[PDB]
Structure formats: structure tokens, C-alpha cells
Amino acid sequence: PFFDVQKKLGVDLDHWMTIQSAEQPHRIPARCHAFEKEWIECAHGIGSIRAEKECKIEFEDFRECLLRQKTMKRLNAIKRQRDKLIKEGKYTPPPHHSGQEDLRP
Amino acid sequence: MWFEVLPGIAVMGVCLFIPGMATARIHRFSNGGREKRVAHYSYQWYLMERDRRVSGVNRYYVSKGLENID
Amino acid sequence: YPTKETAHWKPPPWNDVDPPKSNLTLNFGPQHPAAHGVLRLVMELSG
Amino acid sequence: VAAFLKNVWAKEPVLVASFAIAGLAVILPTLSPYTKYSLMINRATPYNYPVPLRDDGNMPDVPSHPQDPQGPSLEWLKRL
Amino acid sequence: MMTYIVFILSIIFVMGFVGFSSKPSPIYGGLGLIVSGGVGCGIVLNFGGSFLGLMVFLIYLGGMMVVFGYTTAMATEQYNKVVLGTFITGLLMEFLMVYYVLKDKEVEIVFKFNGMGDWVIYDTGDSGFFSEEAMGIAALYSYGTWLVIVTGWSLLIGVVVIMEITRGN
Amino acid sequence: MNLMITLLTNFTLATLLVTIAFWLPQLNVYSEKTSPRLPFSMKFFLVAITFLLFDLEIALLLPLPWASQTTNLNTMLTMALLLIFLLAVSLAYEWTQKGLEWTE
Amino acid sequence: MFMINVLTLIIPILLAVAFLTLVERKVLGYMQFRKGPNVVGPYGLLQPIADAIKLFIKEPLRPATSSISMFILAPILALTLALTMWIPLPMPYPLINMNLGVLFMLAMSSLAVYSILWSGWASNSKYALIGALRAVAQTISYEVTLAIILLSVLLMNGSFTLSTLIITQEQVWLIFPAWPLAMMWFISTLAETNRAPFDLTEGESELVSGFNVEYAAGPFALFFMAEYANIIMMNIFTTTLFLGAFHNPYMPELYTINFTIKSLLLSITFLWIRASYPRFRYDQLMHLLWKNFLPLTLALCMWHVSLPILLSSIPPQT
Amino acid sequence: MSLVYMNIMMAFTVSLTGLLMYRSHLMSSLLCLEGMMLSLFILATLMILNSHFTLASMMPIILLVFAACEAALGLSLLVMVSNTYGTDYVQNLNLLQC
Amino acid sequence: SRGEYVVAKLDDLINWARRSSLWPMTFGLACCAVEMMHMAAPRYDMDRFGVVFRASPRQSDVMIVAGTLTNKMAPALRKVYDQMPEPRYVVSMGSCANGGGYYHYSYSVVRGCDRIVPVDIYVPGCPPTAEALLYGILQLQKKIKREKRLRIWYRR
């Protein structure tokens, strides 16, 4: 019983808060605006069953944009290997990762 | 008579005068003889952190003018 | 079907209304005892 | 409408002032000449960046510079 | 320690929920939920939700828990084992979760979770001359017409509903 | 961080003054002094719930100084006056059905 | 250096609270055709020191409490809130210059009733709890008009920033476009702090303030000084909010002397109202709120919503 | 994912099991319910601020308003129960077993 | 020596703070209440000595028994005395609180409030005038001034 009264009357009651790529106040972009736009423009019109398999890559990029789990796992690997090399003494941090270089701009 | 309350009102007024004058003089002492930078919005903090980086001495209130460019 | 456990269950009332199954009494005194100071009052307050 | 109003201004002047202030607040922007200028000032306040346009060759109403004559002007805002 | 400030506030938040959820009394339950609302409000304030944190203080702690304590003063009379045991049970479970996620930097109770501080996942951009959260809340009036209609209608119906059911007739 | 230092200083000064006012009058060793449900009111609870409901209506009214800055001013003015009108109608229904009685 | 600024805020707060007791007793003395204290110090200036040393060594009262921890936390919370209501106050510069200092003060003053409610829970009297409930209902009642009047005034400000509210009033005092909001604000802040004619705990119209009654209460000096910090604070907040003074950016002491003189006159106006009127009955100030102030406050809230749109006078956000 | 989301979810489940295991009082049940709402508020706010998704900033306000009106309705039910029985104990509310 | 000097100055400080900040609790029993109300009136004005008017019965320093103590209000007098925090003091004002007075031989009158409470200052009169009661209050302050609490503590 999804009585789509909004599309029948042509009124907009709640389609504006629905996605991040909608018309935002003062044109503020969301952090995953491009990824959600790619996933929506992929998955539009082809239905859920074709959208789960034919738009899997845009959906994975958008989920990894939102949650950043692969990015945090990569940073965990880099930080853990860096701390292991500090513990093994085979690595010294550079002057630009120590606070002694007077940043760019 | 009625002016006998004025020593107590004077002491209470000095006690109200101390915090604002104190924070004005502390903001001038802590920021190079000037007002504290008001950063309510992220653009103002962006410019303030740019000032902190371009001063070289890690202070936003050290202003670099036309003497810094060639 | 009554059991050993559900033996204490009486049937509910007919109009589903159960019987409901007081007011405050205050000893009073004047606040600062300079004007009256020797007054005692026993109240029956209703809120 | 005249005797009832004087009677309620005698009895409950707080509520008469309340409904008068509320009624003027409702009906006065529909009769105000300055309500348009609120809209005009709020849309002329540049919170974002005016992202430029690729000049394909024929856009005569879009300027090439801020100080060019064509473009939406704010002489009404300075003058009023 | 200071980089993990939102995590420390979240652990204090979980400890407060264990504190009142064990339910020693409605009075101390209200106290524990007040302290929990304060530290969870601090969690919200440290991401940039200043208006939403002050909505916690002004509305949640300022009105609703005041009304809960007001009603608790009119319900119970002023003057254990299961409460304190469940409290130390929840405290042991939470510190075992903390020790696991700090020694392993990856834990899976229901979902996977990072072991570093949550400072990593922020954005490196600026918003300009506005708070984005403030402008999105300001958009309740221009964009959220239907939302304001249904919320105000629900509050007016709530007034009518409370006057109907507390009348007793 | 300046705010947290200020709050910690204020809470510490409050706790210090409470510790003084509970332990300083114990220094003078006094004598050992030996000689030796509340009625529920519906109106108190109703004024508390009336506060809570109108405070939720205030919570809806709180983004108005930011909402004046919008470009959809007809919609914004309509919904602002509509929320204050719903707060007024809530007060009118609280009036006329004898809800504001003996705590008027 | 910042801790020096915090101490130069919060210790002169306590000294100003100490001498507000002297100013109150003297001004209520001369308004009652008598004198206030003039024996204890030169012109009575050592009266607050003597009275504080007296109260800090007077015995804990007679009884014990229902809840010990809330009996400890109610003065701690009262003093903490009464000292943290000052930190966004721009005078001409605030200590913590926060973007939402108005909303911060309204929220921390909404938190202030827990000291009343926990002191009611802490005392063993079932009648002092009723009095605490009446005081809580009074305070949360007038918080409604505090919030809506404050919102209606900030519709001419543009933001919740308290420092912007000095910039707003550079051409005119904001009491001139908003004097009905100012007078309802002044009476509502008078009714927030349980101040006469609205002081029903410290007066009659009370079921427990009754001469050989129970209820262990805390050290009276701490609730008293938190109350007077609230009084001086709400008068400075009213001064910043309506009677905001001239500010020279190169001479801050001009604005500091100016808001100090206005805040002293407004606190003396509190002292001059409490020595002029009898007390309300409890239902009479409930009537004064819910059937007198709140209709006018909603009417003026609609008026100050729709008025900058019909005058094209919408203040800027920044 | 984010480490603070684990703690806010575990807080929701702690207040859930507090609400799903009554001791004596209905007021403690409503406190556990509003602790659940508090954890929902915090978790929704942290997501919406994290995403910089602008129009959902008004969503936690709607959650807070609707669920505090829900809480006022629950306190009125508690008041009617306490006016009936004298306490807010859950074992007095067992007339409907038969 | 040194410690005797320190406890002497501390006694001087606390006796100054107690006598210069007396808070009276009045028993308005009888006609002497009217004369205490004149002792608080603008002519004599107890409040300029730090002696406040209409203090809380909970926190108060001196109980002023101003009137006739009958047999029906002796336990109320003693219970209000026992609820007072130490140091509590008693000023007996007028002849009926002193020794029964004009109703000394009555069946219903306690013959002096000193049968009920320990009395510090006896203020005689029927009524003793507002100036005479203020004299009794200043004599009570002189009695508080020469207390040796910490000196006797250091010497015990």
C-alpha cells in the first residue's frame, strides 16, 4: 500500500531530504555527492534486481566513501608497519612528519 | 544619607569592572597588542590557520605584509 | 480449561469497571514570629 | 462590533492587544511595499562563489569582468 | 588521550547507560540519564553539532528530564544486589570491549569497527561564512513545509490528548 | 579546550566551596544532639506537561533567526506564523477546556 | 595565561555577590526610611566578610537527608551553573567567544532547576518537596517567555552570537524597538530567580515555610551566593540584550564602565522592586504567566517574525 | 567503521536490555526508553554531521520533539496508573490476565 | 608564645564575625513583640548592627523570647530552641519571660523562660523599651566578644 499520492498530485512532500545529492541549501555539497550521484544514475530505471548486480561497483565505491572502512584498514596497516619499524629501529621519521618544516601556504 | 550606599555600590562596580577589563587586556597581551581573532565560521579559521602557517613562528597574530613578498 | 496454575482467575466484571480500591492535614504557624508568633492552626487542605 | 470591542477592551485588554498585534503581523506584509526588498536582499547576498561560465561565443548578458556594465546590479541596494 | 576525546566521552556515555539501566531507583535513574545526556551531548558538540548539542541541553535535559524528575517527585517516596551486579557486569563487558579494540585495532561484535581515533574520518574542507548544520536546521521552514505541518499537528494533538486522558472523565 | 578548562575550573571551585561548607563547620566540635506518600496534585503535573509541550513548540521555533535569511520568504513566513499560531491554539485549547485552573 | 583570565572572571563574581548582600541591605534600608549596616565596617563594608565567616562556621543545621549524594550535588550544580552563565557574556569581549552564547545561556539556565529539585529530594520533608515542586513549576513556567522573548529579540540580531548584539545596538538601544519584550523580559527574569514579588519559597503562600518545621537543608550561603550570581548575571544579560552600550574597539574600558553602570542600576532596580510590592499568590503568578505574558509574547513573536520582512530590515547572519 | 558508533550502538542495546528487563517501576521503564531515544539522537547526529548531509540536520530535532511528546504521553499514563494504585509498580498492572 | 597568639587572634576573628552578624529568631509571644518591632523600626534599627530583621527560624543565632511563656507553649519554645544550630543564645525580654512578671502567680504561666531554656541576657521591663532591648543586644555582643573558645581549647 505505497499509495504514491506525491507523484499523482505532483506535490513534493519528502523527496528533498531523501538523498544527499538533492538540492541543498546554499548549494552545500555532501562528502559523497559524486559517488551517490553515480550510484543513483547507474541504478535508475533498471529496478532493484538488476541494480544489485549491474551497479555493484558504484555501490561499493559509495559505501566505501560513506564508511571509509578500507581507508581506515589501509591506514591501520601503514601505521602498524610504521610503528613496527620504529620498534625495530630501521626507520626514522622525516622532518615533514615531525613538525619542523613550516607548512606550505 | 542616601550617598552612604555608594561605597558598597562602588566596590560591587569595581568587582564587575575587573572581568571585562581583565579579558580585554589579556586578549591584547596574548595576541600582539590587538584584539583576539574571532573565528565563528570555518572561513575565518581557514584564514587564521593560513596566518599561523605564513608567519613562520607558529603564531597567527604575527602579521606578514608587503615586506614578506619580493 | 482451568488448571492448577490458573485456578485463582475470577472472571472479569460486566461493565469492565473496578472499584477504585484523601486530603492533606497541615499544622500551621506564622512564618516569622514577630507579628503574631503565638498562632497555631490545624488545616485540612485539598491541594 | 463596536460595543463588544469596547467591552472586551475594558475587560481583557491584554487579549485585545494580543489579537491586534498578531493580526497586524499576519496581514501587514501583504500590504507592505518593502516586502519585495527583503526577497531581493536575501537573494543578492553572495554566500557561495559565483562560478563562471564557459564563453561559447554568444552570451551578451553575461559580463567578462565584475566592473562591466552588463550583469545584475545593486544600485537599488545602495540607494533605496 | 586528547585525540581520543570523543571515544573517552563515548565510554563515559556507555558507563552512564549501564549506571541507570541497572535501575537502582527512578531518582538515581534520572540522575544517571542526566549525566549520560551531558556526556553524549559532549560527543555531539565535538563533531560540530553545536545547535543540536544545545538542543539536548535546552530541550532534552532542560524540559523533558525536568518533567521526569518532577513526576518522579510525585510518584515515589523518599527515605542492592541485582543493580550493582548488573552494573559491574556491564562495566566488565565494556572494558573488555575497550581492551580488545585497543589491543587489536579491529573488533567485530555485530559490525567491524576501527581501533584508531575517529578524527581520521572527518573532512578537510571549510564551509565558508555559515555552519552547514545551522543552515540545514534553518531549512526546516523553507524546505520542510510538510515536516513542520505534521510536527505542529502532532504537538497540538499531543496537547489535546494529554488534556483528554488526564481529565479522568 | 578553553571551554573545557573553564568548566573544569568552575566545577572545581564549586566542589571546593561545597567541601569547605561541609567540613569547616565540623572543626568547631559541637555537642552530640540527642533530644528528638505526598498528596498527588493533577494541576502540578498538568503545568509540567504544558511546559514540556510548549517547550517542544519552542524547540520548533528556535531556528527562526537563521530561517529569516532564506530566499523562500513567503513559505518561511507562512510556516513561522503557522508555528506560532499552533502554539497559540495549543494555549487556547489549554485555556478553554479548563486546563489552566487554580494554577492559571 | 588563560587560567588567569578564568580566575579574574570567577573570583570578582564571588566578590560582587558578597557585596550585593551589602548593597541590598543598604538600599532596602534607605528605601524603608532606615539605614542598612554601618557599624560592622566603615560604612558597613565589613558586613559581608563578617556574615560569610559566621555562616561558614555555623553548625550543620539539625537533621539528616534522604539522598546524601544529591544533597552534595545540588550546591555543586547551583554554583557551577551560576559561574558558567558568565563565560559567553560580552563585556566588551566574552571569555569563551562562542557562536551560540545566547542559546548556551538559555540552556544552562534551563538546567538550573535541578538544584531546586534535588534539594527537594534531599530533604526528608514531604512538604518541602511540595514547595520545591512549586518553585520548579514557577521557574519552568517563566522559562517559556524567556525563550520566546529571547528569540523575538534575536530576530533583530541575525544570530545567537552575544558579541554581535553589541554591533546590533550601535545606532539605538534595542529597548526602543522592543520595550514590551523588554518589560515582560524584566519581569520574567525577576520571576526566574525566585525574587520578590515572586519569591514563594522565601516567603508566605507556602506550605513548608512555617516556624518549627523539618527539612534538613544545605549550607544556606552556597545556594544564596549562586542565587545572587544568577541575579547579577541576568541583569548583565538584560543590559547586553536591550541596553547595549557604545563600544570603541581601541578603548574597551568605555564599554566596560558603561555596561557596569547600567547593570548596577538594573540590579538596584531589582532591589527597588522587591521593596515596593507585596507577594503574588502562586496561582496569581501562574495566571500572570499563562494568561497575560504568553499571549502577548506569542503576538510579539509573530510581530518580530513578520516585521523585518515587511520593513526589509533582516539582520545579517555573520 | 567508526569506533564511536560501536559505543553508541552498545549504549542503545544497554538501554534496550534495561527497557527489556523491568525491575519494579514504570518510571525506570520510561527512563530506559528515553535513554534509547538519547542514543538514537546521538547516533543520528554523528552520522549526519559526519556525512555533511545538510538537510538531515533538522532530522534529530524532529526525533527529539516527537519522542519527547511520546514521553509526555507516557508520563500521563504513569500518572493515571499512580492515581489508580498509589505506586507506579508494574505488578499492580496485571488485571488483564483474566 | 606563638600558638597562644594564633588561637587568641582566631578567637578574636570568630567572635567578631559572630557578634557583628547576629541573626535573631523572635518569639512574638506578647506585648514585647511590639517593642522588638520598634527595635527594628527606623529609629533604633537592629539591621545596622548586622542584626537582621525576620531571619529564618532554621538558621538563627539568638532566640529572643519576647512575651509571656505560658504552659501551653513551653514545649514549642523548647523544640524551637533545640532546632537551633550552635552557638545559639537566648535573650529574655520583659518581666514575663524573665520571671513570670505580672502573671507570675498564674496557673498557666511558666515562671520565667529560664525554666525552659538556658538564658544569656535578661532584659527587664514591661515592656523594656526598644532602646533597652537594643542595649541588651549590645550587651550580648559584649558577652560574645569576650568568649575564649579556641583559647580554652588550646589550654585543655
Ligand SMILES: CCCCCCCCCCCCCCCCCC(=O)OC[C@H](COP(=O)([O-])OCC[N+](C)(C)C)OC(=O)CCCCCCCCCCCCCCCCC
Ligand atoms: C529591561 C529594562 C526594564 C524594562 C521595564 C521594567 C521596569 C519596570 C518594572 C515595574 C515594576 C513591576 C513589578 C512586577 C509587576 C507584576 C504585575 C504586572 O505588571 O503584571 C502585568 C499585567 C498583568 O495584567 P493585570 O493583572 O494588570 O490585569 C488583570 C488581567 N486580567 C483581567 C486577565 C485578570 O499586564 C501585562 O501583562 C502587560 C504586559 C506588558 C504589556 C506590553 C504592552 C504593549 C502594547 C503595544 C500596543 C498595544 C495596543 C493594541 C495594538 C496596537 C497596534 C498598533
Ligand SMILES: CCCCCCCCCCCCCCCCCC(=O)OC[C@H](COP(=O)(O)OCCN)OC(=O)CCCCCCCCCCCCCCCCC
Ligand atoms: C575589589 C575590591 C574588593 C575589596 C574587598 C574588601 C572591602 C573592604 C576593605 C577594607 C575597608 C577598611 C577596613 C578597616 C577595618 C577596621 C580596622 C581597625 O581599625 O581595626 C581595629 C582592630 C583592633 O585594633 P587595635 O590595635 O585594638 O586598635 C586600638 C588602637 N587604639 O584591629 C583589627 O581588627 C586588626 C586589623 C584588621 C584589618 C582588616 C582590614 C580589612 C580586611 C578585609 C578583607 C579583604 C580586603 C581586600 C583584599 C584585596 C585588596 C588588597
Ligand SMILES: CCCCCCCCCCCCCCCCCC(=O)OC[C@H](COP(=O)(O)OCCN)OC(=O)CCCCCCCCCCCCCCCCC
Ligand atoms: C488573526 C491573526 C491571528 C490570531 C491568532 C493569534 C493570537 C495571538 C495571541 C495568543 C493568545 C492565546 C490564547 C487565546 C485565548 C482566547 C480565548 C479566551 O481567552 O477566551 C476567554 C476570555 C474570557 O476569559 P475567562 O473565561 O473569563 O477567564 C478568566 C480570565 N479573566 O474571552 C475573552 O477575553 C474574549 C477574547 C475574544 C475577543 C477578542 C477580540 C480582539 C479583537 C482585536 C482587534 C482585531 C484584531 C484582528 C484579528 C482578530 C482575531 C480574533
Ligand SMILES: CCCCCCCCCCCCCCCCCC(=O)OC[C@H](COP(=O)(O)OCCN)OC(=O)CCCCCCCCCCCCCCCCC
Ligand atoms: C551531576 C553531574 C555534574 C553536575 C555539575 C557539572 C555539569 C553541569 C554544569 C556544566 C555544563 C557543561 C556543558 C558543556 C557543554 C556546553 C555547550 C557548549 O559546548 O557550547 C559552546 C560551544 C558551542 O558554540 P560554538 O561557538 O558554535 O562552537 C565553537 C565553534 N567555533 O561549543 C564549544 O565551544 C565546544 C567545546 C568542546 C566541547 C565541550 C564538551 C564538554 C565535555 C562534555 C560535557 C561535560 C559535562 C557533563 C555533564 C553535563 C550536565 C549533565
Ligand SMILES: CCCCCCCCCCCCCCCCCC(=O)OC[C@H](COP(=O)(O)OCCN)OC(=O)CCCCCCCCCCCCCCCCC
Ligand atoms: C600569627 C598572626 C596571624 C594568625 C592568623 C590570623 C590572620 C588574621 C585573622 C583576622 C584578624 C584577626 C583579628 C580580628 C579582630 C580583632 C580586634 C577586634 O575584635 O576589633 C573589634 C573592632 C570592632 O570593635 P567593636 O567592639 O565591635 O565595636 C563596637 C561598635 N563601635 O573590629 C573592627 O574594627 C573590624 C574587625 C575586622 C576583622 C578583620 C577583617 C575580617 C577578616 C578578613 C580576613 C578573613 C576573611 C576572608 C574573606 C571572607 C569571605 C569574604
Ligand SMILES: CCCCCCCCCCC1=C(C)C(=O)C(OC)=C(OC)C1=O
Ligand atoms: C559568600 C557571601 C555570603 C553572604 C551572606 C549574606 C546573607 C544576607 C544577610 C541578610 C539576609 C537577607 C538580605 C535575605 O534576603 C534573607 O532572605 C530572606 C536572609 O535570610 C533569612 C538574610 O539573612
Ligand code: SF4
Ligand atoms: S513583660 Fe509585660 S509588657 Fe512585656 S510582654 Fe510581658 S506582659 Fe507584655
